[PDB]
Ligand binder design. Sequence first.
Ligand SMILES: CC(=O)N[C@@H]([C@@H](O)[C@H](O)[C@H](O)CO)[C@@H](O)C[C@H](O)C(=O)O
Ligand SMILES: CC(=O)N[C@@H]([C@@H](O)[C@H](O)[C@H](O)CO)[C@@H](O)C[C@H](O)C(=O)O
Ligand SMILES: CC(=O)N[C@@H]([C@@H](O)[C@H](O)[C@H](O)CO)[C@@H](O)C[C@H](O)C(=O)O
Ligand SMILES: CC(=O)N[C@@H]([C@@H](O)[C@H](O)[C@H](O)CO)[C@@H](O)C[C@H](O)C(=O)O
Lengths: 284, 284, 284, 284
Amino acid sequence: NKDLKGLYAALLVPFDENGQVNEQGLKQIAQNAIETEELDGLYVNGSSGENFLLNTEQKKQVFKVAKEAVGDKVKLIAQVGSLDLNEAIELGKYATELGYDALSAVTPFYYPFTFEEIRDYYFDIIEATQNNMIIYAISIEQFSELFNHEKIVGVKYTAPNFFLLERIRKAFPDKLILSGFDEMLVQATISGVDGAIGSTYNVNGRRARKIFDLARQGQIQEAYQLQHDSNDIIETVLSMGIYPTLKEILRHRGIDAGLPKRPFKPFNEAHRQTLDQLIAKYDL
Amino acid sequence: NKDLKGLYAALLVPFDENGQVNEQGLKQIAQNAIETEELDGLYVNGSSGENFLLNTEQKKQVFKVAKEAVGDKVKLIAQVGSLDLNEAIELGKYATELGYDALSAVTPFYYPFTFEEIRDYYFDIIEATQNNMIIYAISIEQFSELFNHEKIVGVKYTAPNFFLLERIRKAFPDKLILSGFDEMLVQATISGVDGAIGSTYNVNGRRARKIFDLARQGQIQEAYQLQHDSNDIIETVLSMGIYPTLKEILRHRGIDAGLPKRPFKPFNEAHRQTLDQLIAKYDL
Amino acid sequence: NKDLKGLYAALLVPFDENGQVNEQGLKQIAQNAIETEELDGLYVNGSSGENFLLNTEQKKQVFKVAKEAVGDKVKLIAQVGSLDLNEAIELGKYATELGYDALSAVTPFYYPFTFEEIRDYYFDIIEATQNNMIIYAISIEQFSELFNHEKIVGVKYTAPNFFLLERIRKAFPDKLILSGFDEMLVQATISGVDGAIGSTYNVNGRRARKIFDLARQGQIQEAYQLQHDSNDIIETVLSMGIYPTLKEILRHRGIDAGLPKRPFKPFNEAHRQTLDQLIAKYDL
Amino acid sequence: NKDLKGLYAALLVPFDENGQVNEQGLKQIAQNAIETEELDGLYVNGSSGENFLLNTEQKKQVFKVAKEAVGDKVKLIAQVGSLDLNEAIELGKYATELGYDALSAVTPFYYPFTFEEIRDYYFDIIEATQNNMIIYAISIEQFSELFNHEKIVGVKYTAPNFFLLERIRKAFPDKLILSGFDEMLVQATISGVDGAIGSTYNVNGRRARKIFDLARQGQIQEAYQLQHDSNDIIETVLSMGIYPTLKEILRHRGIDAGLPKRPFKPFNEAHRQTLDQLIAKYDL
Ligand SMILES: CC(=O)N[C@@H]([C@@H](O)[C@H](O)[C@H](O)CO)[C@@H](O)C[C@H](O)C(=O)O
Ligand SMILES: CC(=O)N[C@@H]([C@@H](O)[C@H](O)[C@H](O)CO)[C@@H](O)C[C@H](O)C(=O)O
Ligand SMILES: CC(=O)N[C@@H]([C@@H](O)[C@H](O)[C@H](O)CO)[C@@H](O)C[C@H](O)C(=O)O
Ligand SMILES: CC(=O)N[C@@H]([C@@H](O)[C@H](O)[C@H](O)CO)[C@@H](O)C[C@H](O)C(=O)O
């Protein structure tokens, strides 16, 4: 199997009027991420896929359509984290046996779980699935204990703290760190991350690779300049409602983008003009 | 079609090792709330019931068992809110048909939902269930808009703010306000709440009701004294892990309180004896 | 000597064009708080007095005028807190010998001071003045170590937390607790405070005594109603800029109440009509 | 005059045990930064020099000694921000007459000042001194309004947010941006800052230069390794109390670094060995 370096699209998901998965749309979006946007993998059933709004079978369904839509070279990570540990294990099992290269799982939220409970949450999932696990982000000393598990191969780092990122990069040199913040990709890149996961790479993945490459290939100034342009895109998208707007941009490419699953509201058409100017300026 | 003032137990729920509901153990906890603690009703599948760790079928299960557990004298509120809007509607109808007096739904969390998305999450559930709804706590202007809908009969108020609570109370003298903070019951009472929902009422319902009545009768210094050592209990139980420690205190009464659902951990025995020291001091 | 319980006006201060103190205005305001509003005492050079915008000379200046405006029976608390400990001790001495019945000092802010540095800040001021001290903002055990000192007679309690207030009151029955949140007086009173310090008592002093008295006598419903009324007032002045607005209300009584000290801005005349209506509705 | 690109020490200040400035030790700390760490300039009476613990005459004192101690080619920025706008104007005038190249002012704190009050605080100081101003503490238009002023030549940027920093660098390509976070120099550098202001540069100024230089020449990976080194130094120093520990390191170079001003506590000797190890490991 792989090491999981590279740039991943946080897979977006198209729905009908009743919060049901549009599979033909979903296949188009996965294929847009690899063939058109030229990314290395898909990060399936994360935040960006409106995962936590779904029921278990929808999650399995998305896991299914995504894996079928792409070649064997395409790296795949499966987010299975859920407040329902039994569900996590079940999705973990289902995903592992579909051939997903690694699992990852959101930290137990809502309740104020203790570190110990958070820790044995990950360990229980690994134990029942025997797949590689990527965690979320916790102190250095607590990472230290998590990464002591041979099956916890790394972290999806989403906290915009570049002091903590550097301490983590220095202390765990042989561990996978993927950054989760699109608008600070070039800062993550020189801070030594091994790749990135991103909702906006569904639309802007070709610029993201240049940032990631130029910044490691010395050409930091040009990389920055491309981060300037991407942050124009990101700030605009964030301002209209990020997921529906991204899917609105993909619809413009002849993709069946469907709707957001409620309680997410659809793209508000009062934003239509501004979005078309954005689509025109950066050619999306 | 009944009155909703009063003190509620937020139903605690017993599980086995595989995180399955201990059916018979639940029945007891239900009855312990009504008969021994003498509470006006049951708040079912709220956060205290570990509800967000469950799948839909367990949630229906807890709904039926809690209902068949109690008399009709007993007010029943069904917490039905979930990130899955479809699931909330399904639970909503199901709880309504079972005869729960009002529905109730947590604020859609995890994502940064706009206020209009939050508003139409409630309106969608009300529409599909045609049952009275109790919301969580969002500004006063926004409350005004939400309370404008007729089938929104009030709010379960958990925010530490007594300025805002006073403003709501004044601005909506005809809507129901149940407070959610056990350790400040005496302050919510004289702020004119219509009742309270609590986890610690499973154990301490009789000091709770006396806090509630004595305060309304202006016997306030007495009511306070009771808060002053209901807070002993609460401070203690929080420092040990509130839901497993609470269900520990019920085991000490012959109730089959089972285990927490993982990733919640079982009560840690290193506390066991500060615990029953307290069960002793306050006769729990 | 003096019993420090009671209601205190946090003393507003009038300035001229250049930021220099209006002593005649100040004396009127001082007298208004005792003679007109019938308060047991003054709290001089607190936040409400724009104290932290002042130089040392001016702070003394205020301390002197406030002493010379009232009678011997009038309780007088001096806030001398400052990031400059040399300054605090200089004012601490000056105010103690003017005859102020106690000193108060804000917790050292801006820098992330440790508890030890904070503790010994308070102890250093007492040792140099031998006067009584009221602490002004930490852990209940920290309170213990602070209140373990005989010359720390109490705390000006400002944080809107009624669990923590309940704990401090149970744990230190012999210590003085004055609350600083006017809009939650009634809740503070039934929580056993010995009195209160408020900016708005300069203007709504008489309703505050009634709130404080009625609450204690079990006339809780009438107390809460006067809280409704007073919160209309409080909410309104907060929305117009509280210190400039409070002072505007005072000018209506013919008190030469002057200007805020820059960079505070003068009362915006666009709020004039709404303020005049507030004044008329509540007879201010 | 000079245009203020480059690296500045946030000038540390030595005190006797009564909190009076050790002027000869200060003169030594000043030359240390320029002659030994080879920095481009001094940032004087910022928070690293314990400015907000001082009185006005001490502040002028530190402005005076620091200017005397250095050659005319040294860039000098005077922090004259105070809550007392009269004090700030006075200090700004003084530092300007002494010859300081620019003033700088902390945003008004402690009170909830509006944006307008903040804007006109800066505008008042500028008009009274006719010196260039460097702002620091939030919107982009709020930034754009301040930056509209030709005397506000830039900003000491201390918020560790690299989305906003990028947004400002793009929107104002011609303004001066100096970063204030030493532990993220390399991330600041590639984000296009014109330089940096730092307390630890008093001790690590040469490594900081190399980070700033190497990154801009696109040798990002060796710049980053030097950031790894500097963060060891910064993390250790924060864990021991940063200002006292920085001055202890200076003392080891024969500088009379004296004592922190109370309520700051002096360096704790239980940290001596760990500090000696750091000094040895990094040749400090
Ligand atoms: C919370 C979130 O959606 N963040 C996403 C980022 O791609 C974007 O920067 C974010 O959507 C907007 O900045 C990304 O990390 C998604 C996340 O990896 C996931 O699990 O889908
Ligand atoms: C966080 C929490 O569970 N709060 C509970 C309160 O009764 C208590 O004050 C809490 O358990 C202890 O602070 C209660 O509001 C739970 C809530 O009502 C529910 O839906 O179960
Ligand atoms: C921060 C502040 O000025 N709070 C005041 C309260 O009286 C009022 O509740 C506040 O002004 C309006 O909520 C009062 O505590 C003043 C303060 O104690 C002081 O030292 O002057
Ligand atoms: C609050 C503080 O001391 N920050 C300093 C930074 O150099 C360091 O990164 C800070 O010490 C944390 O490491 C520095 O920015 C101080 C500031 O520039 C000043 O005005 O002295």
